């Protein structure tokens, strides 16, 4: 089916690879060449996840756990029961996430939009690629990746944190947390302002950009404007993921002690050493 205004927009063009061959829709979904590759990697990766569950101890959704190999295998592919299945699924996930980004570019090109969405999603792909590729590769073993399991990856996060005794003291982590918290605040403010001028109390005219700028101005002391709040939201949300990737890649490859003792440089500034 189509939105009442949609049909006019469904032209050919804007593809990156396939030309007209895959330039069609399936229900609501645009396909394209990277749609085909997406569904390939999604299906293969999903069915291998189901196989991992089948050969594991339970079907309980929360307890399924497909673990990476032991560190002794280094950068080789382990036996599939022993973590090689995790390594294949990781390749499928990279293939799927990459295909999804490039498919979004084909869609943006067909609509004459800017490329912002593909790149903003690249911030998440960067963070994933850091956790499963870049950081494991710098540590010299694929076994440093997180396990694929709804709670077992939380056991990994816990243990990686305490590998540095008190992970809250990681300075890039403090920045990343600040971005996540500031983003959620900014999202609530922006959502509230737009809804408050479009849904004023009954018997009140629809509001205006002037009213939301006046309200925003006496909240923060300055008016950010309509383009400004969207630039800020993009900056905060994507900046959180980028600082997240930094905070985890410095932990291990570049810093090995507890994080609290990193702050020794601040105590030793010569003005007060």
């Amino acid at each position: 089916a189509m939105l009442s205004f949609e049909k006019k927009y469904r032209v050919r063009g804007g593809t990156l690879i396939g030309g007209d061959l895959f330039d069609f829709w399936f229900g609501p979904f645009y396909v394209g060449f990277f749609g085909v590759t997406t569904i390939f990697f999604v299906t293969l990766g999903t069915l291998l996840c189901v196989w991992g569950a089948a050969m594991g101890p339970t079907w309980n959704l929360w307890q399924i756990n497909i673990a990476p190999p032991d560190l002794k295998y280094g950068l080789g592919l382990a036996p599939l029961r022993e973590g090689g299945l995790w390594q294949i699924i990781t390749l499928c996930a990279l293939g799927a996430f990459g295909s999804w980004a490039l498919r979004q570019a084909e869609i943006a090109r067909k609509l004459g939009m800017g490329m912002h969405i593909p790149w903003a999603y690249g911030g998440a792909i960067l963070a994933y690629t850091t956790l499963v590729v870049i950081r494991p590769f710098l540590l010299g073993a694929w076994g440093h990746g997180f396990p694929y399991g709804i709670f077992s990856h939380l056991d990994w996060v816990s243990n990686v944190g305490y590998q540095y005794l008190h992970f809250h003291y990681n300075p890039a982590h403090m920045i990343a947390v600040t971005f996540f918290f500031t983003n959620c605040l900014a999202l609530a403010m922006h959502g509230s302002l737009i809804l408050s001028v479009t849904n004023p109390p009954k018997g009140t005219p629809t509001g205006t950009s002037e009213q939301e700028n006046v309200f925003f101005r006496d909240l923060l002391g300055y008016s950010i404007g309509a383009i400004g709040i969207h630039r800020l939201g993009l900056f905060l949300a994507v900046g959180a993921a980028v600082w997240s990737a930094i905070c985890i890649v410095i932990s291990g490859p570049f810093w090995t002690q507890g994080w609290p003792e990193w702050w020794n440089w601040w105590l030793n500034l010569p003005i007060w050493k």
Partner: protein
């Protein structure tokens, strides 16, 4: 291709807004001004603020709360102004000792803490009232004060959960690294907060808030050249920027919001972050005392092979004691 990430041409207007919309009681404080730096990223006007009675009292109550915290931190380094700056992130104003329960503690052993907490709480409530009155004066919906009420709810659970377990000692210390020490020790005391399902939900909405604002920020910038940032007019008088935004997400993931309703998705994801959070805190130590064991009971916990096995005499030998009071003497061991 222009990315619309910063503004190469700003325009000034000599008269200005900042003189509010018709607002009645209270006073507009200061004269509007332009920052060229603010004008690069967003709108350039830095300008007048409204307080009214609730805003004035909120600042008075809040300033006292900030003074009490800072003066106690500064007293804790013996009034040394160098050590005050050098050690600032490790300093705290610390809650009362556990043995008092809910009784009033000595002034230097948590009495200042409860005072600062009281004036901060009153200041936060008066700020909520200030925002509520301002939204109505500008003839707006009440979405913003209810969004702020969700944050206040989570904050209040750092008072109610200590109340429910029966001791002010459990409250959060005022201090940069010290409140992170509390955050870690809370998860330790209650047996790993990852297995608290409302904590898991709160994270799902915190991450989802970043997902939505990244998607929505990027979407509007991607159609901003077609006027897509004029969101109110795209809601009342749908243009091609809205249509393209709907079609992008429809063609990408098979469903779409509207230019209005994406702001409801935004509002609920942010609000549910702190609302589910508060529920998880209130349940901790009152209903569940070990979240990992609650996870085992309800089947959350993935099995691993055993890393050690105890014999029955080790099971008796390796039980400890619960931690007690500190030794209040300096023993001589000489005989």
């Amino acid at each position: 291709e222009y990315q619309n990430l910063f503004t190469r041409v700003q325009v000034r207007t000599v008269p200005e807004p900042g003189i509010p919309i018709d607002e009645s009681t209270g006073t507009r404080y200061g004269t509007g001004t332009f920052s060229y730096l603010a004008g690069k990223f967003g709108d350039a006007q830095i300008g007048p603020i409204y307080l009214g009675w609730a805003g004035v009292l909120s600042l008075i109550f809040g300033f006292i709360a900030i003074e009490i915290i800072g003066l106690n931190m500064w007293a804790s380094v013996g009034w040394d102004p160098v050590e005050f700056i050098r050690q600032l992130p490790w300093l705290a104003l610390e809650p009362p000792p556990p043995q008092y329960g809910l009784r009033v503690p000595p002034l230097n052993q948590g009495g200042w803490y409860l005072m600062a907490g009281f004036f901060l709480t009153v200041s936060i409530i008066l700020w909520w009232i200030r925002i509520y009155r301002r939204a109505r004066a500008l003839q707006m919906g009440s979405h913003l004060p209810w969004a702020f009420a969700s944050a206040i709810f989570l904050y209040s659970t750092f008072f109610f959960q200590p109340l429910l377990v029966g001791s002010w000692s459990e409250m959060v210390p005022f201090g940069i690294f010290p409140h992170l020490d509390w955050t870690s020790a809370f998860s330790i005391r209650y047996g790993n907060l990852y297995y608290n399902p409302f904590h898991a939900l709160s994270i799902a909405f915190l991450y989802g808030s970043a997902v939505l604002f990244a998607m929505h920020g990027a979407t509007i910038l991607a159609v901003a050249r077609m006027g897509g940032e004029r969101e109110i007019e795209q809601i009342t008088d749908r243009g091609t920027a809205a249509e393209r935004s709907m079609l992008f997400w429809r063609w990408c993931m098979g469903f779409n919001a509207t230019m209005e309703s994406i702001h409801r998705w935004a509002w609920w994801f942010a609000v549910l972050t702190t609302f589910t959070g508060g529920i998880g805190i209130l349940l901790t130590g009152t209903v569940v005392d070990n979240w990992y064991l609650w996870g085992v009971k309800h089947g959350l916990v993935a099995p691993y092979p055993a890393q050690n096995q105890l014999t029955p005499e080790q099971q008796d030998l390796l039980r400890g004691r619960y931690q007690g009071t500190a030794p209040d003497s300096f023993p001589s061991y000489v005989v």
